[PDB]
């Protein structure tokens, strides 16, 4: 049972920080990903990261752009969106996966989302 | 009644019969239901955060290839049957190492049903992973999970169902586990995504509240006592130097032991644990108790009605900071 | 053929036995030979036998060295003895309450995995004859009181199962604990009133008296308590040491009574020596006679 | 050697409280059961205990209607009959099973049988 | 569809197979692709200067002599296959002791694609050693 | 090594106790047997006795009517007689037995035996 909030969006022409804010049993949930999906297009990884350890991951298109940390204590997740481009023009969400739930790329593995922020550049 | 019929029958339904391919190879996925009846947990362990379980594993599917006219019995076949018969690779996704029993002989069933449906029965015992959050220990609750997967079939290719719904895992009230009491049971379905496709998945999972009464008489105990026995000091005389310094370092020395045996049968963890709260909470009342002295011992020679009413009041607020200290502790913790 | 071991920690024992199992199979019936014939183990593998498993076993296996421990005889009626030598770790559920004045029932249950009692029936052969050796078992810290054997049916989900079950009594031999227990905490217990007849002037004497008998009655409890499943109850034993260790911890108490108040009253302090003496080792030969009344 | 005594039946139109008193060998038996039988049809499982954990099952029928537990000080253990139906309405018996004496719903597996409240309504 | 179609290609597949000889046997390398998913390191050991490394190990590889024609399948066959057909003699070098793991069947997968290229799959538990320097330990 | 001496027999019309003293290696023979031969028969087992332990063991003839027991601090086993027949007319004989030396009933297991007291009643 985890709860998911976002923030930090909006519309740009830059670099910009979407936030995550998690709450409830994080434990069995050790993953936190990044997701996004464009009008009509499936839903896409954007990366992953781990609460204990800090293990990253990133999908080729974002790699050495986006990049996303947390901080335990707030129970916090970010993703840091520099160098942005018209591509990056989607519903952004913030997904939680369990354990032993199967390959970070694929959002069914995922159990917990949050609402979606649009962001349009 | 034929044997020799019984064996035409069987001999029958293995002529031509291909292990490699699923029942409906090509076509719909082939349906298999789980039961399970746990036998035992017979260990947890925090130091290899894994525990021991031992099971029936029970599967049933519809194989139509081996559908017999004719008799109407089921047909329960001595168990090297298996070996000539497609089973599902069926197998534990957080299992450690595991083994099917074999003595007196490989602990496996099969019955036929005359429509062709195969109940195949199997008993386990498996040492499975569970990770446990020790923050709060040891007034924890684990949640310990066995998962349960297709090996090389995909969603294409096999279901996965509990057969019964959430009756299908029998036996919890068997569990009799000294330290721990099993508050729920779950039983779960979903698919899993890899690279290599989508496999059918099977989670039991069980919410283990673990016993406090060990750690009150064997932990929380000893040091509430070693504590009480600190406070001894303030009622012998501030002469008796030896004597009082004595009681600081014996109580200061032994709030050591209790941790280092504690510690002795837990995980290297870098975490702060709730007992470990409560023995540093101990140990600066005792650390404390031995500065008091330090404290008196500088100044008696020349303030002796000042060293007197410290020991004076120590005999109270040592003894209630304590109360409190302990108040605090085991509201927010039970 | 043996007991080897009985686990408090693991709540099991491991038993090593020769398993025979006696059936007809008129397949194997033969004519024109008045033998029986023993064949060679391998021939097993050729046969039917049943599929009976140990449902409290943990661990098992069938002896390996030289060949397979394993024997076959055919009789002319198609009786077929089947002989196993089988060591096999069993689970033991122990209760703890009176330990170490405790006595277990460890058992051994026998049941067909697959067939009901459709297809098998189990019987004792010989009834209550049919489990020989018990006099075998050299259990240094057991003695075995009584064996019983048991025939039942027994129903799952997926049928009727024969069941037998062998059961031993155990009761566990006291002597180790006397000599490494209960021997050094009385013997704690009285270096403490030593503490009594020191001159009340020796303040160090008497609060090192005080702190190394409570401190070793410490080191009894975490040496018996590292051989022993983290049960939740307190055992017979824990009672024993609890009682030791009050006796202890009051007669430091004591000392600190006397220490404040013989300055001031100087005979009061002379009075609570002088009655402690009688009063400490009477108190506990009563705690110790309460104890081992209840207990034995 | 278990002797198992129950109370608490009587005839009502409404909550009711069955109890039953356990004595001897109980470490052995460690499961406590409920079965009823009405006047013609076969003996039928009503929910088991365990007495130590307090591990409960119940029939689908008495299944967020009736609850048991039980206190180990006493030895006892108690079917509490809320929600009460003319369905309900048989002989209810006691029992204890062993600790490898088969699945909880089968009553030829339970070994020490106590009298049997009648119970009408 | 058929099954005794694919009992029939599967056959054809493996008569006359020898196991003895690697694909392309005296022609050029076989080319071998590696995958790993780890699952867990379970435990690391100063003492034993080893660890404990749990995985999916997957192996591709083309054996022309597995093409089949007339199924737009992929076959995915009974793990016990894998004793009839040729697979790597891949090892770990710095492992101390491994096993595939066996419960209920043993841990290992074979899919075969139209074009001949085998996925062989094995879950493997290795104790591996770790040399470890310890001067800042 | 194991010497065996054996008293208390005797002429009777009754309880009797016959006892069997030993001395020598009687760690390696752990368990004492009581044998009779009758005049023309076959030596018959009646009972044997750990040393250790004091597990017993009777023939079904003697079962409810003799007792076998002993003390360690004498190295001394007894046969209590009581309740006597004109069948039991043998020369009663003591034996040792050692620790792998097959079943209890067949006196060709045992290694050490007594002189033999003639019993008549
Ligand atoms: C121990 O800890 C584990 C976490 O590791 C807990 O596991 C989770 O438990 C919950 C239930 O408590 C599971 O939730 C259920 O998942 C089902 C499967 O969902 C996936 O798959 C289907 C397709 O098969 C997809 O449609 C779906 O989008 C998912 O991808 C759902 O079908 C369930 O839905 C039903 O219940 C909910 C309410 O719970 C309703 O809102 C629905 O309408 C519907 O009726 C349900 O959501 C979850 O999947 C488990 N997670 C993991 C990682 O396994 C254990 O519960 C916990 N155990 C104990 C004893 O505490
Ligand atoms: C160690 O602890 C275990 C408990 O875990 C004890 O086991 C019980 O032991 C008693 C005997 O002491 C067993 O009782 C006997 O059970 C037989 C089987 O009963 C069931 O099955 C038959 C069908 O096969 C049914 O008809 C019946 O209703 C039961 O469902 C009975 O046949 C026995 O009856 C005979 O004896 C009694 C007196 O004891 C007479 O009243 C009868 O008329 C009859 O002659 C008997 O009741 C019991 O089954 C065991 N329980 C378990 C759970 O196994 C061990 O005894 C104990 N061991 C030691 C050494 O202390
Ligand atoms: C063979 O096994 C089947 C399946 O276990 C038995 O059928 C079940 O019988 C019970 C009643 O005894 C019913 O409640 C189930 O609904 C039945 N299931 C199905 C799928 O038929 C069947 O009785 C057994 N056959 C024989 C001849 O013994
Ligand atoms: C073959 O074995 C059988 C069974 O063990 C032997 O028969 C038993 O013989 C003893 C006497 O030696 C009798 O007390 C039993 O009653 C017999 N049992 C049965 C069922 O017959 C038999 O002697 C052996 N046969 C050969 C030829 O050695
Ligand atoms: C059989 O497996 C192959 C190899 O995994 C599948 O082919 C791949 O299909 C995906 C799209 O689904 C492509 O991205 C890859 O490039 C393909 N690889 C190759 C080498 O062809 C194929 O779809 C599967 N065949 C069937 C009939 O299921
Ligand atoms: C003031 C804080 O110091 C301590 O608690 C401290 C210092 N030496 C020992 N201890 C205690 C026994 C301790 C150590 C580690 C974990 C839990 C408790
Ligand atoms: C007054 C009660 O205190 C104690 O018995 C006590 C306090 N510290 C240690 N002990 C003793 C040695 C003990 C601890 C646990 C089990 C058995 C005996
Ligand atoms: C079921 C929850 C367990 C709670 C255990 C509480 C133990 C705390 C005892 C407090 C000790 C105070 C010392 C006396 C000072 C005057
Ligand atoms: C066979 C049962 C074992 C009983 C062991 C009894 C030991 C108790 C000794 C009592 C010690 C009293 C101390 C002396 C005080 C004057
Ligand atoms: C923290 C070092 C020890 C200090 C002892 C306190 C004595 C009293 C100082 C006035
Ligand atoms: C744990 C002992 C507490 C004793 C307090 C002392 C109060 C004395 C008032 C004269
Ligand atoms: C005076 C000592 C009080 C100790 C705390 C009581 C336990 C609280 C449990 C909720
Ligand atoms: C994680 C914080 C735990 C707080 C409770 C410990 C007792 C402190 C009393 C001052
Ligand atoms: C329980 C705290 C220690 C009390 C010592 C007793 C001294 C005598 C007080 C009058
Ligand atoms: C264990 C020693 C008991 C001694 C009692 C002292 C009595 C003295 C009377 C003058
Ligand atoms: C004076 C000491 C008495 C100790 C108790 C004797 C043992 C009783 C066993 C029943
Ligand atoms: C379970 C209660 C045990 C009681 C006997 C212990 C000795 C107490 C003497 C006061
Ligand atoms: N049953 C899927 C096995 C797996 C996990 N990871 C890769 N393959
Ligand atoms: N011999 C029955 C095996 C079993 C136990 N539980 C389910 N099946
Ligand atoms: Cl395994
Ligand atoms: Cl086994
Ligand atoms: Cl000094
Ligand atoms: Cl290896």
Redesign the interface.
């Known amino acids: 049972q985890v709860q998911l909030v976002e923030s930090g969006g909006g519309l740009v022409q830059g670099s910009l920080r979407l936030s995550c804010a998690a709450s409830g049993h994080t ?2 949930y050790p993953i936190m990903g990044w997701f996004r999906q464009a009008p009509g297009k499936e839903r896409e990884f954007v990366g992953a990261i781990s609460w204990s350890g800090g293990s990253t991951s990133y999908a080729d298109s974002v790699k050495d752009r986006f990049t996303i940390s947390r901080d335990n204590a707030k129970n916090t997740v970010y993703l840091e969106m520099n160098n942005l481009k018209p591509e990056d023009t989607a519903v952004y969400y913030c997904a939680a996966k369990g ?5 970070l790329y ?1 959002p ?2 995922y159990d917990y989302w949050g609402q979606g922020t649009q962001v349009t550049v | 009644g034929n044997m020799s019929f019984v064996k035409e029958t069987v001999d029958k339904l293995l002529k031509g019969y291909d292990i490699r391919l699923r029942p409906d190879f090509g076509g719909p996925p082939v349906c298999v239901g789980m039961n399970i009846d746990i036998a035992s947990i017979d260990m947890v362990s925090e130091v290899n955060m894994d525990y021991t379980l031992t099971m029936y594993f029970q599967q049933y599917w519809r194989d139509k290839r081996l559908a017999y006219s004719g008799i109407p019995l089921n047909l329960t076949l001595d168990n090297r049957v298996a070996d000539q018969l497609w089973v599902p690779d069926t197998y534990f996704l957080n299992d450690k190492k595991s083994f099917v029993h074999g003595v007196t002989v490989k602990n496996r069933m099969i019955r036929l049903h005359p429509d062709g449906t195969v109940l195949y029965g199997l008993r386990i015992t498996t040492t499975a992973a569970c990770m446990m959050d020790l923050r709060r220990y040891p007034l924890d609750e684990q949640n310990c999970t066995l998962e349960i997967e297709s090996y090389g079939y995909t969603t294409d290719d096999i279901e996965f169902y509990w057969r019964g719904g959430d009756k299908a895992v029998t036996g919890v009230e068997r569990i009799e586990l000294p330290q721990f009491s099993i508050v729920e049971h779950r039983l779960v379905s979903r698919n899993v995504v890899f690279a290599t496709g989508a496999y059918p998945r099977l989670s039991l999972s069980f919410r283990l509240k673990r016993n406090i009464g060990y750690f009150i008489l064997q932990t929380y105990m000893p040091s509430i006592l070693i504590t009480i026995l600190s406070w001894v000091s303030f009622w012998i005389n501030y002469d008796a130097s030896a004597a009082r310094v004595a009681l600081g370092i014996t109580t200061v020395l032994t709030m050591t032991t209790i941790n280092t045996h504690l510690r002795e049968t837990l995980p290297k963890i870098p975490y702060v644990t709730a007992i470990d709260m409560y023995l540093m909470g101990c140990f600066v009342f005792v650390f404390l108790a031995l500065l008091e002295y330090a404290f008196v011992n500088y100044i008696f020679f020349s303030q002796p009605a000042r060293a007197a009413a410290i020991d004076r009041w120590s005999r109270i607020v040592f003894p209630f900071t304590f109360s409190l200290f302990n108040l605090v502790y085991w509201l927010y913790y039970v």
């Open positions: 434990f069995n354990r032993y739930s199967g390959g694929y069914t593995n």
